Amino acid sequence: HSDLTFCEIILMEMESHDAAWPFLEPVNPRLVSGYRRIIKNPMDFSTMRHRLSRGGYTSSEEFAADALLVFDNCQTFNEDDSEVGKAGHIMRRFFESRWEEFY
Template sequence: MQPSRRSHRRSQVLDQSLPLDNAILQDLLMELIHHKDAWPFLRPVQKAQVPDYHLIIKRPMDFGRIKNKLNMLVYVHNSEFIADTLLVFENCQMYNQSEAEEYKAGARMSRFFRKRCRQLGLQIPDEANPPPAKKPRLSS
C-alpha cells in the first residue's frame, strides 16, 4: 500500500533539521489577521473589483491563502510561510501608489511582521544575510 501524500509530507516535516513551527506560525498569522491594517490582505484581490491586478501581480498572495496552506500542512519550513507573507507586502508595494491607503497599510504591516519575527526568533531571509560592508577604497 502506498503512503498517502499527507503522511509523506508529514514525514518530510519530521525529517527536516529546521522543522515547521506550526503553533508559533498559527499565532503569528492570527496576530496579522487581527491587526488594524490587515483589511487589504485578508482575501484574494478580485478581478471584478481590480481588473488589472492580475496583469501586474503574477504571484498573488493573501492571509486567507496563507492560513489555508498552514492548516493543510503545505509549508515544510518556516521560511516558506515567511516568504509567502513577505510576498503579500511586496505585491502591495508593487501594485499600489505610495499615497494609497493600501500601500500605507502594507508598509505598517510589513514593519510589524518583521518586528514580530525578530521577537519570535524567526529569520527573515534578507535580514539573515545582510549584504557585506563595502571595503574602503585604497587611494593610490
C-alpha cells in the same frame, strides 16, 4: 505540524491587525482591473491560513516568504500614500517585528 504553531500565531496577529483589511482575502480581479496581469503571484492571509491548516508549509521560511510576498505585491501595485499602500508598509514592519522575536 505543531512545529509551526508560532507561525499560526503570527498569522492570527496579522489577521486581527488594524491595517490587515486589504490582505485578508485574494484581490478580486473583477474589482481591481488587471491586478492578476500585473501581479504574477498573488498572495493573501487566507491563502496562507489554508496552507498552514492543511500542513502545506515545509518550513517557517516558506511561510515568511509568503508574508513578504503579500507586502511586495502591495508595494508593486499601490502608491505609498494610498490607503492600501500605507497599510502594506505598516503590516510589513509588524510582520518583521514579530519574526525578529524568533530570529
